[PDB]
Nucleic acid binder design. Structure first.
Ligand SMILES: [K+]
Ligand SMILES: [K+]
Ligand SMILES: [K+]
Ligand SMILES: [Mg+2]
Ligand SMILES: [Mg+2]
Ligand SMILES: [Mg+2]
Ligand SMILES: [Mg+2]
Ligand SMILES: [Mg+2]
Ligand SMILES: [Mg+2]
Ligand SMILES: [Mg+2]
Ligand SMILES: [Mg+2]
Ligand SMILES: [Mg+2]
Ligand SMILES: [Mg+2]
Ligand SMILES: [Mg+2]
Ligand SMILES: [Mg+2]
Ligand SMILES: [Mg+2]
Ligand SMILES: [Mg+2]
Ligand SMILES: [Mg+2]
Ligand SMILES: [Mg+2]
Ligand SMILES: [Mg+2]
Ligand SMILES: [Mg+2]
Ligand SMILES: [Mg+2]
Lengths: 71, 39, 58, 51, 171, 110
RNA sequence: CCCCACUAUGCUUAGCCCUAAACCUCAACAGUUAAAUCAACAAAACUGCUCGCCAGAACACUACGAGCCACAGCUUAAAACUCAAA
RNA sequence: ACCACGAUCAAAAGGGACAAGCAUCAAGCACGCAGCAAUGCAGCUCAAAACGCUUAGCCUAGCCACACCCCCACGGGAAACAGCAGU
């Protein structure tokens, strides 16, 4: 068989990798912002729980950890 | 597929029919903005 | 008999048997070892199946 | 009457089972006798080789 | 482990083995043999200690005992060879096959299942119903939901005493 | 004899004993697949009152409906342990068995 | 593309990463060689049973979401517009 | 007619059953049990699809739901044809 289908995929992946290289600094700023919103969306999910259970503050001694940071 | 697989998958789910430029309607009213020619 | 629970059990005992649980609480043990499938169907029809008259009436 | 007839059919099948099981023990014992003989020779042969 | 002076399973029942020279006893002992010979002696001890017929090797009991000896050999092997991925696979597969044997023995002969567990020191465990990744977001939310439950329980008990106290005052 | 519970007699397998005096029982029924016209097991969970806590996970039990439910999910009581897990008694002969093999021969008591 | 020099790298140790035309592109178990042998080519045609997967092309080994020691990554993976073919 | 220890009819309550699409909605977060109570145990649902989002009146001798909105209607917004004819 010919490799014409492979050749299409080859070009797509090449142009994709090149696009990522050309915009890797903008993508890093966007990725950082998404992780911040992801952490906020996570904190809201937990706060909803204790508030809907009748508590007014977080359980004594509870600190929501940062589960999306590289550290 | 096997009978167990066909039972587990169920009947085939066919995607809801797409709506064309009329949004599933025979005609639409419009206001002309500009006229031109296309090749 | 869509409303009768039928449950199957493999290789739990040395010989095959059918057991029926009735609403009164009575249990009917039917030994089926050595019997053909047609004889099993005729046996349980006789002891626990509705006769042709009872069905004609319904 | 049908429950009693079914209980009698089970008793009949039980007597046929016990007769079938007795014939299987006599055959099982014959085989079990030969295997012990064969197994005893293989032990004596294996024991002599080790000795 | 059996003492090194233990004789091989093949030479333990030959007549007159106790009157031979000490050198001949060393040459027919575990000290002068490979580890596989020591595992055959371990398998024999477990059989007499557990199974009703120590000569029946095809029973589900004997297979569980044989596989348990292999499992212990893999664990000792991997204690010294921690990057041996081939034997790590054999251990995990063997543990899964003993659980599959123990399941079938528990379903068929519970009295024998109990003696196998006591004799071999196996703590039978029922499988978990759901195997799913406990990722960070799940492990944190589940922890918070347990803390919220514990706090709600405490508050509900302090709403029993205050109501109890006020009711007594009316009297 | 009347009861408000729909399922009057059901057989199932005990799958849980972590509740006090309550056995969690998986009951399977055959349900016809309308398109394939093949029967497939459909399983449902029932809580059964077990006063003596004699049920073990894996044994086949017979459940009887209560006159009225005793709890939100407890609508049945343990009526009989049909097949004790690993301790099955052959109903046809009355002798103990381990799978398809007898542990005591029926010829012992003739 | 050809010649020379030299580095990351190929090696060891301790951790990661988890991708290949990872393809013998031919799933596991059991069975058959008779009937119709059989689109073509390839590595002859089939049966039982089970799981996995597939449903025009392209968009797309992409977007978003989610998970991940991965932060120019991997896994899962669409839709709109477009074509009457591929 | 009134009574029928009843029949018919049919609420509430209890048990069971009961739409479609999406798993890129995979976890839900108290969803269980025992006890006369006190209280104790830590369970309950879920890849055989829970929880969630979106779409839709339905299984048509008819049925369900709604009746301007705030699911409800003390109260409030506000002043109501989704009764007929009509605009
Ligand atoms: K691949
Ligand atoms: K290849
Ligand atoms: K309303
Ligand atoms: Mg070529
Ligand atoms: Mg392209
Ligand atoms: Mg170098
Ligand atoms: Mg080297
Ligand atoms: Mg290769
Ligand atoms: Mg492949
Ligand atoms: Mg496979
Ligand atoms: Mg084959
Ligand atoms: Mg396609
Ligand atoms: Mg790739
Ligand atoms: Mg990607
Ligand atoms: Mg992304
Ligand atoms: Mg009602
Ligand atoms: Mg109801
Ligand atoms: Mg998406
Ligand atoms: Mg609507
Ligand atoms: Mg109006
Ligand atoms: Mg209203
Ligand atoms: Mg009108």
């Amino acid at each position: 068989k010919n490799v014409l289908k492979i050749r299409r995929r080859k070009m797509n992946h090449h142009k994709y990798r090149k696009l990522v290289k050309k915009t890797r600094f903008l993508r890093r700023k966007v990725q950082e912002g998404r992780l911040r919103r992801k952490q906020i969306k996570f904190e809201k999910d937990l706060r909803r729980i204790w508030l809907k259970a009748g508590l007014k503050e977080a359980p004594e001694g509870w600190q929501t950890p940062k589960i999306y940071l590289r550290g | 597929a096997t009978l167990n697989q066909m039972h587990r998958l169920g009947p085939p789910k066919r995607p809801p029919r797409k709506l064309g430029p009329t949004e599933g309607r025979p005609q639409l009213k419009g206001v002309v903005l500009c006229t031109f020619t296309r090749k | 008999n869509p409303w009768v629970q039928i449950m199957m059990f493999k290789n739990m005992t040395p010989s095959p048997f059918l057991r029926f649980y009735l609403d009164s609480g009575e249990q009917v043990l039917v030994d089926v070892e050595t019997k053909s499938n047609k004889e099993i169907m005729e046996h349980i029809r006789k002891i626990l199946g509705k006769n042709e008259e009872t069905l004609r009436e319904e | 009457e049908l429950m009693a007839w079914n209980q009698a059919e089970n008793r009949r099948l039980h007597e046929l089972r016990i007769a079938r099981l007795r014939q299987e023990e006599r055959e099982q014992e014959q085989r079990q006798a030969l295997e012990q003989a064969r197994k005893a020779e293989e032990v004596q042969a294996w024991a002599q080789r080790k000795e | 482990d059996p003492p090194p002076s233990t004789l091989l399973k093949d030479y333990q029942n030959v007549p007159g083995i106790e009157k031979v020279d000490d050198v001949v006893k060393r040459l027919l002992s575990l000290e002068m043999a490979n580890k596989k010979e020591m595992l055959k002696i371990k398998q024999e001890q477990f059989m007499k200690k557990i199974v009703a017929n120590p000569e029946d090797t095809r029973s589900l009991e004997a297979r569980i005992i044989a596989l348990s000896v292999k499992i212990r050999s893999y664990e000792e092997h991997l204690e010294k060879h921690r990057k041996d991925k081939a034997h790590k696979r054999y251990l995990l597969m063997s543990i899964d096959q003993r659980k599959k044997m123990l399941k079938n023995l528990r379903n068929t002969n519970y009295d024998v299942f109990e003696k196998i567990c006591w004799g071999l020191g196996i703590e039978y465990t029922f499988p978990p119903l759901y195997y799913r990744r406990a990722h960070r977001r799940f492990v944190t939310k589940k922890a918070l939901c347990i803390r919220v439950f514990q706090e709600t329980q405490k508050l509900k008990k302090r709403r029993r005493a205050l109501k109890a106290a006020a009711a007594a005052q009316k009297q | 004899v009347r009861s408000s519970v729909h399922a009057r007699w059901i057989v199932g397998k005990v799958i849980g004993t972590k509740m006090q005096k309550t056995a969690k029982v998986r009951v399977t029924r055959l349900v016809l697949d309308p398109y394939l016209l093949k029967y497939f097991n459909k399983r449902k969970t029932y809580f059964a009152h077990d006063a003596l806590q004699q049920c073990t996970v894996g044994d086949i039990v017979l459940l009887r409906a209560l006159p009225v439910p005793r709890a939100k999910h407890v609508k049945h009581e343990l009526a009989e342990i049909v097949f004790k897990v690993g301790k099955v008694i052959d109903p046809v002969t009355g002798k103990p068995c381990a799978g398809t093999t007898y542990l005591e021969s029926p010829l012992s008591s003739e």
